[PDB]
Design a protein around this motif. Structure first.
Motif, PDB file in Angstrom:
ATOM      1  N   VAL A   1       3.875   9.893  -7.113  1.00 20.63           N
ATOM      2  CA  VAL A   1       4.625  11.110  -6.684  1.00 20.63           C
ATOM      3  C   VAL A   1       5.993  11.084  -7.358  1.00 20.63           C
ATOM      4  O   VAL A   1       6.392  12.031  -7.949  1.00 20.63           O
ATOM      5  CB  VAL A   1       4.530  11.280  -5.248  1.00 20.63           C
ATOM      6  CG1 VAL A   1       5.293  12.428  -4.864  1.00 20.63           C
ATOM      7  CG2 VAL A   1       3.064  11.446  -4.869  1.00 20.63           C
TER       8      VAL A   1
ATOM      9  N   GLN B   1       0.825  -1.205   0.000  1.00 15.66           N
ATOM     10  CA  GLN B   1       0.000   0.000   0.000  1.00 15.66           C
ATOM     11  C   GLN B   1       0.868   1.267   0.000  1.00 15.66           C
ATOM     12  O   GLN B   1       0.587   2.230  -0.726  1.00 15.66           O
ATOM     13  CB  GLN B   1      -0.922  -0.049   1.263  1.00 15.66           C
ATOM     14  CG  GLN B   1      -2.017  -1.031   1.122  1.00 15.66           C
ATOM     15  CD  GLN B   1      -2.796  -1.459   2.270  1.00 15.66           C
ATOM     16  OE1 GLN B   1      -2.399  -1.231   3.395  1.00 15.66           O
ATOM     17  NE2 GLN B   1      -3.888  -1.999   2.195  1.00 15.66           N
ATOM     18  N   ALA B   2       1.933   1.304   0.861  1.00  9.28           N
ATOM     19  CA  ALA B   2       2.839   2.459   0.845  1.00  9.28           C
ATOM     20  C   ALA B   2       3.407   2.662  -0.570  1.00  9.28           C
ATOM     21  O   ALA B   2       3.492   3.846  -1.020  1.00  9.28           O
TER      22      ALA B   2
ATOM     23  N   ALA C   1       2.107   1.722  -3.540  1.00  5.85           N
ATOM     24  CA  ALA C   1       1.074   2.149  -4.436  1.00  5.85           C
ATOM     25  C   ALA C   1       0.830   3.637  -4.286  1.00  5.85           C
ATOM     26  O   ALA C   1       0.599   4.351  -5.222  1.00  5.85           O
ATOM     27  N   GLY C   2       0.835   4.102  -2.994  1.00  8.56           N
ATOM     28  CA  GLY C   2       0.572   5.509  -2.720  1.00  8.56           C
ATOM     29  C   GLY C   2       1.775   6.403  -3.230  1.00  8.56           C
ATOM     30  O   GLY C   2       1.510   7.505  -3.738  1.00  8.56           O
ATOM     31  N   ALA C   3       2.937   6.012  -2.969  1.00  2.54           N
ATOM     32  CA  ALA C   3       4.216   6.797  -3.261  1.00  2.54           C
ATOM     33  C   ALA C   3       4.439   6.867  -4.698  1.00  2.54           C
ATOM     34  O   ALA C   3       4.909   7.927  -5.215  1.00  2.54           O
TER      35      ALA C   3
END
Length: 20
Positions: free
Chosen positions: A15, A7-8, A10-12
């Motif tokens: 960016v 999840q970290a 996928a989120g990063a």
């Protein structure tokens, strides 16, 4: 651990994509 890891990233991801 696996779910959180994933999840970290996928989120990063996007960016980092905007800057490199």
């Amino acid at each position: 651990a696996a779910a959180a890891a994933a999840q970290a990233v996928a989120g990063a991801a996007p960016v980092a994509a905007q800057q490199f």
